[PDB]
Design a protein around this ligand. Sequence first.
Ligand SMILES: NC(=O)c1ccc[n+]([C@@H]2O[C@H](COP(=O)([O-])OP(=O)(O)OC[C@H]3O[C@@H](n4cnc5c(N)ncnc54)[C@H](OP(=O)(O)O)[C@@H]3O)[C@@H](O)[C@H]2O)c1
Ligand SMILES: NC(=O)c1ccc[n+]([C@@H]2O[C@H](COP(=O)([O-])OP(=O)(O)OC[C@H]3O[C@@H](n4cnc5c(N)ncnc54)[C@H](OP(=O)(O)O)[C@@H]3O)[C@@H](O)[C@H]2O)c1
Ligand SMILES: [Cl-]
Ligand SMILES: [Cl-]
Ligand SMILES: [Mg+2]
Lengths: 216, 216
Amino acid sequence: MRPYVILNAAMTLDGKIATATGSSEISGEEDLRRVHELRRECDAIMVGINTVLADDPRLTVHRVDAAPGDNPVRVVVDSMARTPPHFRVLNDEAPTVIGVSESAPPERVAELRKRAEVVVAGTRRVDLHLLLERLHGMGIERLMLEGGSTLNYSMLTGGLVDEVRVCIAPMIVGGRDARTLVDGEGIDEMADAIRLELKRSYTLGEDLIVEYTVKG
Amino acid sequence: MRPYVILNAAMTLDGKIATATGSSEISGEEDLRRVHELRRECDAIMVGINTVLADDPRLTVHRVDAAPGDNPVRVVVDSMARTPPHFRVLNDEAPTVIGVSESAPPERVAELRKRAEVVVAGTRRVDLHLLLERLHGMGIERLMLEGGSTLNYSMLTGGLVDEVRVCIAPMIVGGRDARTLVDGEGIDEMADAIRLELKRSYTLGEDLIVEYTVKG
Ligand SMILES: NC(=O)c1ccc[n+]([C@@H]2O[C@H](COP(=O)([O-])OP(=O)(O)OC[C@H]3O[C@@H](n4cnc5c(N)ncnc54)[C@H](OP(=O)(O)O)[C@@H]3O)[C@@H](O)[C@H]2O)c1
Ligand SMILES: NC(=O)c1ccc[n+]([C@@H]2O[C@H](COP(=O)([O-])OP(=O)(O)OC[C@H]3O[C@@H](n4cnc5c(N)ncnc54)[C@H](OP(=O)(O)O)[C@@H]3O)[C@@H](O)[C@H]2O)c1
Ligand SMILES: [Cl-]
Ligand SMILES: [Cl-]
Ligand SMILES: [Mg+2]
C-alpha cells in the first residue's frame, strides 16, 4: 500500500520552481503560511536529495504555531546516501528517514543511521513504490511531496500522487535550463498526459493557488 | 510608438507549451474559440519562425464565424527568411509581414516579397523594437503575440508585452527538454523577474484562464 500523497509547489507563471542558478524565492508570505499549515496536517514530508543539497531546508512547521508533536516525519530520497550529516534536515526538530538504494556506499549509510532511520529500497535508484510501502508501515497515511522537479516526475508517472496544489506567483523568469514544476524524461505526447481535475482556485496575497486531484 | 501587445498562450499545469517531440495539443475547443475571437479584435498576430515551421498554421479567424477583413495582419519573426514559400501563413487569406535580419540570403528575401511584405530589421537577429515601430506604420495598434517560448522571452525582456493571457490545461507532461511558456536564456535571479498583476482568473470548459498585466 502507500500513504495519501499531496504534491505541493510554488512556481512562476512560466512554470519555473528555480532558475538555472538555483534562485527559488517565489512564494509570498501568505503561501508560506499555507505551506506550513499543510505540513502540520500531514504525517510526513518528502523531498529529493537535490533539493536538500541546494536549499539546506529544515522541512518543519515554523511559520505557524506548532504543538510539540506537530512536525511530520522528514523523508529524503537519496539513492547514494549524499545527505550531509551536518545539514538541517538531520537536526533534532523531528524524526528523519533517508531512502537510499542498495548501491549507496556502506560508509555513508552508517553515518546517516546515527542521525536518521535509513530505508534501503531499489538497486541503484530509489524504488519509490517500496519506500512508500515502508513509510505506510511506519503509520504514515498522509504525505506531503515538496519536490523537486525530478522527484515530482517519478512520483507522478509512478501513479503515487493523489493531489496537486500549486502556488502560481505573478512573475516570469524564463530560462531553457530553469527547473520547472515537473522535469524528468517527460511524456512524449500531449494525448498521454497525466490528467487532473481542478477542485479549487483562490488568491492568497499576490499569489494564485490552484488545487487539483489526479484523475485515476 | 509600438502596438499594444497581448501575449496569448496555452500551457500544461507544469508550464509546457509543447513536448520535446513537438506535441502541442493543449487547449479545449472553448479556449480556441476565445483565441479566434481575440484575434479578430487585434490588428496583427505575431509568431516566431520555429512555430511556423513546426505547425504550418493559417493564423486566421476560422474557429468562429468571420467576415472578409476580420483577419488581422500575420507577422512572422524570421531572421534568415526561412519561411517556406508554400506555407499556409503565406496564402491569400490575409496580409502577411515577414520581419528578417540583414543577414538573410537575398534569394530567399526576394522570394518572400512575392507573397508578403518584408521588413528588414536588425543585423543577425530581428530587432523587435524596430520591427514593432515599423508595424505601427502599417496601422497596427493592437498585436497578439502567439509564441513560441524563445520569441516570448525576447519580447518580454525587451519590454514589448503589455498583457499576458494563459490557458492552463489540467494536465502534466513533464520533460526537461519540453518547451515552456517562456524559454530563452532566462533571468538569473527571482528578484529580477518580470512582475505581473492578475486581472482575473476563470474556468473555460476544462481549462483555467488567467489574465495578467505586465508591471515591468
Ligand atoms: N518552488 C518549489 O516548489 C520547489 C520545491 C522543491 C525544490 N525546488 C527547487 O527546484 C530545484 C529542483 O531540484 P532537482 O529537480 O534537481 O532535485 P530533486 O527532484 O529534489 O532530487 C531528485 C534526485 O533524487 C534522487 N532520486 C533517487 N531515486 C529517485 C527516483 N526514483 N526518482 C527521482 N529522483 C530520485 C536522484 O539523485 P540521486 O540518484 O543522486 O540520489 C535525483 O536526481 C531545486 O533547486 C529546488 O531548490 C523548488
Ligand atoms: N501553446 C502555445 O501557447 C504555443 C504557442 C506557439 C508555439 N507553441 C509551440 O511551442 C514551441 C516553441 O517554439 P520555439 O520557441 O522553438 O520557436 P519560436 O519562439 O516560435 O521561434 C523563435 C525563433 O525566432 C527567430 N528570431 C529572430 N529574431 C528573434 C528575436 N529577436 N527573438 C527571438 N527569436 C527570434 C529565431 O530563429 P531564426 O534566428 O532562425 O529566425 C528564434 O529561434 C513550438 O513547437 C510551437 O509549436 C506553443
Ligand atoms: Cl523549511
Ligand atoms: Cl491557425
Ligand atoms: Mg526546460
